[PDB]
A paper describes a structure:
The genome release of iflaviruses can be induced in vitro by exposing the particles to acidic pH. We show that acidic pH induces expansion of the RNA genome in the DWV particle, which, in turn, triggers the swelling and flower-like opening of its capsid. Native virions of DWV at neutral pH are uniform in size with a radius (the distance of the center of the mass of a pentamer from the center of the capsid) of 135 Å. The changes in the organization of the RNA genomes of DWV in acidic pH are connected to the radial expansion of the particles by 15 to 33% relative to the native virions at neutral pH. Pentamers of capsid protein protomers maintain a similar structure to that of the native virion, but the distances between the centers of masses of adjacent pentamers increase from 141 Å in the native virions to 164 to 192 Å in the expanded particles. In silico simulations of the expansion of DWV capsid have shown that residues 1 to 61 from the N termini of VP2 subunits can change their conformations and mediate attractive interpentamer interactions up to a distance of 7 nm. Therefore, the N termini of VP2 subunits enable the flexible expansion of DWV capsids and the deviation of its overall structure from icosahedral symmetry. The capsids of genome-containing particles being larger than those of empty particles provide evidence that at acidic pH, the genome exerts pressure on the inside of the capsid. After 30 min of incubation in phosphate-buffered saline (PBS) with pH 5.5 at 34°C, the capsids of 80% of DWV particles were open in a manner reminiscent of the opening of petals of a flower. The opening or removal of a single pentamer from the expanded DWV capsid results in the formation of a pore with a diameter of 190 Å, which is sufficient for the release of the RNA genome without major unwinding of its putative secondary and tertiary structure.
Residue numbers in the entry:
A (entry chain A): 2 to 74, 79 to 141, 150 to 250
B (entry chain B): 21 to 44, 46 to 250
C (entry chain C): 3 to 51, 53 to 94, 97 to 198, 200 to 279, 285 to 286, 288 to 289, 295 to 315, 323 to 330, ...
Write the structure that this text describes.
């Protein structure tokens, strides 16, 4: 058995527990779930106008998942340098998950146009490749929200759990079973603008950052051990 | 009617608690228990383990609802000859909790230690090729077989998958990955260390009981394709 | 009714907090259909597991120690550090490592404290007889990593074990330090920021005397589990990354790129000036006095040749038909862009073509030539 204990040979007196930092710093940390709701960068993109897009056109689409994206490293100096952050490092330790996610997408300053954002639980995830942000229409019955840039250029979201599942896969997904692609992402969030073709040209090569966190609904399943790790100071200068 | 014994006390490592029957949410067909016939034990993999197998080496990546059938269709007969598995031939959709014993019959003078580990949905990950090692599967709960005392590894494995039913044949929403729950993988930790005049062989037998199964969706047995080799 | 009472007097801010993850009501824009809706867990879908001490109470296999017959009565078996950060190296230009679960969940925090129960599982028959110290010295630096043996070990805290009919024991490594916590050994990618508080040692006190029917060598497995008093406090940048994507990109400078927010570019026209992203910037090539520079990469044609200050505060890269028109002798030789010599060397506007853009930020090659 793993967690057995054959013969304790303790030398120690009993340590005063700090209560996981509650005694010093005034706050507990034993519950890792309350750390998980600290926001982490999800994926940063650069806008790129390909066609003279219609107002209906989504500017970028991305699947929505707590696993962390297919990591897209002119490299992005964070994903070149600060590997993975926190939440996929914890999410490596659990085979499944079930629960909500929060997003809080942040938009640049020079944009002014109105922003529509969709949740699409119809969309599956086909393989770990093309499970990243994709620079590409607006739809009716999908769950929608418009943030106005002129009031505040940061939308926030509580994207719920819409799967017909007991829970969903949390490690990186190779798409073995064909219906299992329905059971990895929560769905697919799409961000599109109402900008016309003349004004969207100024917004080219502006960064659009997306954050994420779980938001109290997430409950991880069966334990799985960690994968092999890379030590970050060993990365070259 | 299959009764099996061991001389030594087991070392179970239950991964998850016992699950519900789950027949109320998605089956209106005759959901029939078969505890008189399917709860028999059945040998699915025996293999020779000698000292030439190195430290971090696989022995058998048994996929357990498949390997109950794969040992049958490997062993020169169809499903209708084994009374454990004829409800897989008739019915189309399966659920159920498994019991898995990994018996060893090592001599006492041998020194070695296998491990048995259940993992959920091995084939639904690509990164298990980085993980398929003793250090990864030690962190999750796992049974241990010491070849010194010839310990046995009983191993309760409750059914836990994303969808609450595993199909048994080609099904209109998935085909690949049929009746797959994950990997029972038997990784060596301590290899056989013996004298020059030592007993080299060490056979390992794996039995499986299938008790809280439910079968639903009765259909014709001519639809049931063979499992993959 | 007229509401003439004087109103509130606030402060706007643009974003809710990020590090706050606790008893704090967070307002959002839910894409759920229901306002009182919460994701739920039915009778089988209530998940089993999440807690730092739920991770820190799992053994992880961390060291294979060979233990032979002819190891002497003072031979070292491991000098490994008494932190949760236990070094286990797997044999890429970056290397990957196993860790204990308490090691990783320590590596997602700044500080740790408490005991560390290392389990020694000594795989042998009951015919082997052994004896070995598991000692523990608090506070040995790197220069004191030498001078170590069992005789100087037994001054400190130590546990002598007899390998017999029982073969396994979990020693509980104490937490002995001056500080209430202890800083993470590795930190971010940052060469300053500290070794272990204390060191474990394991010497063979009495060597293995096996029987002649069994083997001379014996495996010793060393597991690591966080102790019962283990606890971590401050959430910082993690020191460990996954191996889903082991790709790494260096940033030596002898390589070129377009400036940030100016790639991808395309060949086109500009009324102040072929030359765009609004003209795309380019880095200033570090040319000393008496040289010239031209570019060849690693419209109507692919533009494999291309730097001079535009006059509007940023550099421009002019496309040429070949490296001959590009080969900078005029401009570094004292000319200017308005020269007729320069205007003949330029590409005319008709070569704009359909104008397919470059793929991202294509790394050019900086050719430096004497003048």
């Amino acid at each position: 058995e793993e967690s057995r204990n054959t013969t304790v040979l303790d030398t120690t007196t009993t340590l005063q527990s700090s209560g996981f930092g509650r005694a010093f710093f005034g706050e507990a940390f034993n519950d890792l779930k309350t750390l998980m709701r600290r926001y982490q960068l999800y994926g940063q993109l650069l806008l790129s106008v390909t066609t003279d897009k219609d107002i209906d056109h989504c500017m970028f689409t991305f699947p929505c998942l707590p696993q962390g994206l297919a990591l897209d490293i002119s490299p992005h100096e964070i994903f070149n340098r600060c590997r993975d952050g926190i939440i996929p490092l914890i999410a490596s330790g659990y085979r499944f998950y079930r629960g909500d996610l929060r997003y809080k997408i942040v938009f640049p300053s020079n944009v002014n146009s109105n922003i529509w954002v969709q949740h699409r639980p119809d969309r599956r995830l086909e393989g770990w490749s093309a499970a990243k942000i994709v620079n590409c229409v607006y739809n009716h019955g999908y769950a929608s929200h418009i943030q106005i840039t002129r009031v505040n250029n940061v939308i926030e979201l509580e994207v719920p759990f819409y799967n017909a599942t007991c829970y969903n896969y949390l490690q990186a997904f190779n798409a073995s079973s064909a219906a299992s692609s329905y059971a990895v992402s929560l769905g697919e969030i799409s961000v599109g603008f109402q900008a016309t073709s003349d004004d969207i040209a100024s917004i080219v090569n502006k960064p659009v950052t997306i954050y994420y966190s779980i938001g109290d609904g997430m409950q991880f399943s069966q334990w799985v051990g960690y994968q092999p790790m890379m030590i970050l100071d060993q990365l070259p200068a | 009617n299959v009764v099996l014994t061991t001389q030594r006390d087991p070392s179970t490592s239950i991964p998850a608690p016992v699950s519900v029957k789950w027949s109320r949410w998605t089956s209106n067909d005759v959901v029939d228990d078969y505890a008189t016939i399917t709860s028999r034990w059945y040998q699915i993999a025996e293999f020779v383990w000698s000292k030439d197998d190195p430290f971090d080496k696989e022995l058998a990546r048994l996929i357990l609802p498949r390997a109950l059938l794969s040992s049958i269709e490997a062993n020169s007969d169809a499903i209708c000859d084994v009374p454990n598995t004829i409800p897989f031939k008739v019915h189309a959709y399966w659920r159920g909790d498994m019991e898995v014993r990994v018996q060893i019959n090592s001599n006492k003078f041998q020194v070695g230690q296998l491990q048995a580990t259940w993992y959920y949905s091995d084939h639904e990950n690509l990164n298990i090729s980085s993980k398929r090692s003793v250090y990864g599967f030690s962190q999750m709960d796992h049974a241990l077989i010491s070849a010194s005392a010839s310990n046995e590894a009983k191993l309760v494995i409750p059914f836990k998958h994303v969808y609450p039913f595993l199909p048994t044949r080609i099904v209109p929403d998935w085909t690949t990955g049929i009746l797959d729950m994950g990997a029972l993988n038997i990784r060596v930790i301590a290899p056989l260390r013996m004298s020059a005049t030592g007993p080299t062989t060490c056979n390992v037998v794996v039995f499986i009981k299938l008790n809280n199964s439910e079968f639903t969706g009765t259909s014709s047995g001519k639809f049931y394709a063979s499992q993959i080799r | 009714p007229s509401y003439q009472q004087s109103p509130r007097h606030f402060v706007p801010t643009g974003m809710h907090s990020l590090a706050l993850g606790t008893n704090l009501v967070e307002p959002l824009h839910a894409l759920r259909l229901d306002a009182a809706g919460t994701t739920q867990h039915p009778v089988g879908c209530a998940p089993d597991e999440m807690t730092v001490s739920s991770i820190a109470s799992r053994y992880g296999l961390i060291r294979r120690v060979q233990w032979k017959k002819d190891h002497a009565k003072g031979s070292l078996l491991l000098q490994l550090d008494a932190d949760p950060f236990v070094e286990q190296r797997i044999e890429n230009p970056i290397s990957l490592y196993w860790f204990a679960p308490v090691g990783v969940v320590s590596s997602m925090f700044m500080q740790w404290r408490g005991s560390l129960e290392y389990r020694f599982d000594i795989i042998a028959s009951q015919f082997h007889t052994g004896r070995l110290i598991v000692g523990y010295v608090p506070g040995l630096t790197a220069s004191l990593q030498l001078q170590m043996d069992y005789m100087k070990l037994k001054s400190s805290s130590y546990v002598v074990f007899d390998l017999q009919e029982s073969n396994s024991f979990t020693f509980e490594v104490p937490y002995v330090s001056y500080r209430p916590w202890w800083v993470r050994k590795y930190g971010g990618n940052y060469l300053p920021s500290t070794d272990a508080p204390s060191t474990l040692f394991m010497y063979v006190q009495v060597p293995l005397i096996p029987m002649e029917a069994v083997s001379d060598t014996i495996d010793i497995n060393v597991y690591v589990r966080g102790g019962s008093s283990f606890e971590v406090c401050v959430p910082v940048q993690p020191s460990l990354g996954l191996n889903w994507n082991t790709d790494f990109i260096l940033r030596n400078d002898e390589e070129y790129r377009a400036k940030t927010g100016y790639a991808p570019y395309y060949a086109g026209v500009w009324h102040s000036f072929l030359v765009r992203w609004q003209i795309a910037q380019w880095p200033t090539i570090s040319v000393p006095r008496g040289e010239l520079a031209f570019l060849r990469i690693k419209g109507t044609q692919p533009w494999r040749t291309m730097v001079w200050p535009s006059g509007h505060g940023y550099n421009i890269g002019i496309p040429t038909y070949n490296a001959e028109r590009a080969r900078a002798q005029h401009l570094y030789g004292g000319g200017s862009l308005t020269d007729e010599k320069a205007k003949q060397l330029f590409v005319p506007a008709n070569q704009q073509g359909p104008g397919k853009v470059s793929n991202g930020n294509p790394v050019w090659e900086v050719m430096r030539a004497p003048l």
